[PDB]
Amino acid sequence: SLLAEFGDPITRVENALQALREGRGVLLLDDEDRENEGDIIYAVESLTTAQMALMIRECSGIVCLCLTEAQADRLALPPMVVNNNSANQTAFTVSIEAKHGVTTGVSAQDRVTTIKTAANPQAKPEDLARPGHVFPLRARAGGVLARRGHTEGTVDLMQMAGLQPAGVLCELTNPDGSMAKTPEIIEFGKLHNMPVLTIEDMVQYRIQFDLKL
Amino acid sequence: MNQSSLLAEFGDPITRVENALQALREGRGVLLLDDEDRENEGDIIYAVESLTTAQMALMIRECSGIVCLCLTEAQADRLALPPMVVNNNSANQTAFTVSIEAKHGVTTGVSAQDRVTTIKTAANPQAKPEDLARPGHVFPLRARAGGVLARRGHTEGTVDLMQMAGLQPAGVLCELTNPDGSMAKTPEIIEFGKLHNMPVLTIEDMVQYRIQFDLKL
Numbered sequence: 001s002l003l004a005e006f007g008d009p010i011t012r013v014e015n016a017l018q019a020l021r022e023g024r025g026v027l028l029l030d031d032e033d034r035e036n037e038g039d040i041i042y043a044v045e046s047l048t049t050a051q052m053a054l055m056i057r058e059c060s061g062i063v064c065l066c067l068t069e070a071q072a073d074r075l076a077l078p079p080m081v082v083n084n085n086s087a088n089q090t091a092f093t094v095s096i097e098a099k100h101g102v103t104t105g106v107s108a109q110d111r112v113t114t115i116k117t118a119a120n121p122q123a124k125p126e127d128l129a130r131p132g133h134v135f136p137l138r139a140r141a142g143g144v145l146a147r148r149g150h151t152e153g154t155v156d157l158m159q160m161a162g163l164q165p166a167g168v169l170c171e172l173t174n175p176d177g178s179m180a181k182t183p184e185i186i187e188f189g190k191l192h193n194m195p196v197l198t199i200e201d202m203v204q205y206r207i208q209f210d211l212k213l
Numbered sequence: 214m215n216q217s218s219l220l221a222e223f224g225d226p227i228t229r230v231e232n233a234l235q236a237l238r239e240g241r242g243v244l245l246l247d248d249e250d251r252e253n254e255g256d257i258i259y260a261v262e263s264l265t266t267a268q269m270a271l272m273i274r275e276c277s278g279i280v281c282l283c284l285t286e287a288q289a290d291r292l293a294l295p296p297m298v299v300n301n302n303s304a305n306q307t308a309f310t311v312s313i314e315a316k317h318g319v320t321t322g323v324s325a326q327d328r329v330t331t332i333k334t335a336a337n338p339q340a341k342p343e344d345l346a347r348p349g350h351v352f353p354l355r356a357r358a359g360g361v362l363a364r365r366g367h368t369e370g371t372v373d374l375m376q377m378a379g380l381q382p383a384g385v386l387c388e389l390t391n392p393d394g395s396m397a398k399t400p401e402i403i404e405f406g407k408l409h410n411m412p413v414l415t416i417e418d419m420v421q422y423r424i425q426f427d428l429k430l
């Protein structure tokens with residue numbers, strides 16, 4: 001009901017895709033009975049220090065880099081934990097840092113440097129120190145049709161938009177520390193020209209338009 | 214405009230440590246600077262045993278958001294939290310363990326209330342490994358035996374401060390960040406302290422104090 005302000009589910013996806021093509025961010029909500037959380041998403045292709053700074057200012061600050069299994073393997077990033085027993089099996093790899101061009105790794109600029117370094121299609125494992133202050137996530141093969149996570153949503157959006165299949169995500173957080181919920185996510189999107197969409201929107205879009213990716 | 218001149222208003226090095234200990238006993242935060250030729254960063258530090266949702270929320274608002282839990286090696290061991298990486302090649306060998314979530318009493322783990330729950334669960338000296346799920350959204354750090362007299366890091370400074378204050382040896386830390394995303398330096402750290410009632414001290418302050426009054430912790 002609140003989401004209708006951003007259009008019908010297909011329109012909501014199209015507007016998100018176009019925002020990403022224009023180098024802008026989007027807000028992605030998962031199922032209400034899952035995390036019921038909204039994440040800011042940026043395309044790595046066009047990622048700027050300003051965008052990263054905004055993400056740190058407005059979100060959890062635990063900025064994650066969503067990668068394909070193939071890119072994660074290229075980087076030799078094993079899962080952070082052999083036996084993952086997190087509630088949602090969040091696919092955290094070992095954390096990373098650019099080995100060149102950063103200092104402590106935590107500044108907005110430094111995180112962008114690390115992210116650009118990792119997402120590079122010609123990247124090598126030795127391009128990244130471990131541990132670091134950027135947190136890669138392995139997207140499941142099949143994307144949101146196989147796992148209904150923001151992780152898959154991020155990589156799927158990039159692929160659907162024709163962009164570098166790597167994106168950054170972080171959870172929108174209210175000033176008092178509680179997580180933004182649907183009305184706050186809607187308001188944020190309207191205030192800051194960021195399309196809002198849901199995982200279910202993406203699932204319907206992909207099935208409807210026969211998008212194999 | 215050197216650091217010692219700027220910091221003088223917080224008192225002499227010994228006064229600066231004594232004020233930080235007092236703040237922690239009163240359940241307030243402190244701001245800890247490491248060496249200017251090291252990270253040259255200021256971290257907010259809180260004691261775990263008095264940690265509140267509001268304190269955590271401030272860290273999320275104003276710091277990197279990668280909020281770390283400084284633990285003794287014994288505590289990390291009882292939680293089954295070895296180093297995240299066998300062969301750590303990060304710039305200053307930051308002793309990250311794998312990340313953690315409370316097994317019970319949290320949802321996604323990332324809210325201020327959830328992080329506090331996870332941190333208090335992890336810092337409990339009777340905790341068992343099954344009390345935590347991995348990976349998570351709280352990042353534990355293994356402090357070096359010997360504290361700042363073994364490693365001049367915020368990690369050690371955090372645990373040493375709790376011990377010197379007579380609190381349980383667990384604290385949380387996060388790096389203060391400027392609104393433009395850059396990391397806060399001594400002038401901005403000083404202003405933040407005076408805005409948020411946090412005393413400011415340095416690792417060198419701590420080292421000099423321990424050498425004079427607390428060689429063994």
Ligand SMILES: O=C(NO)[C@H](O)[C@H](O)COP(=O)(O)O
Nearest residue numbers: 062088090149150151152171
């Ligand atoms: O918890 C996370 N990051 O720390 C998650 O990657 C993000 O918030 C949502 O992840 P998921 O929806 O793919 O499980």
Ligand SMILES: O=C(NO)[C@H](O)[C@H](O)COP(=O)(O)O
Nearest residue numbers: 279281305307366367368369
């Ligand atoms: O990078 C970190 N945490 O993410 C460090 O724990 C924090 O910046 C201070 O670490 P230090 O113990 O090397 O001074």
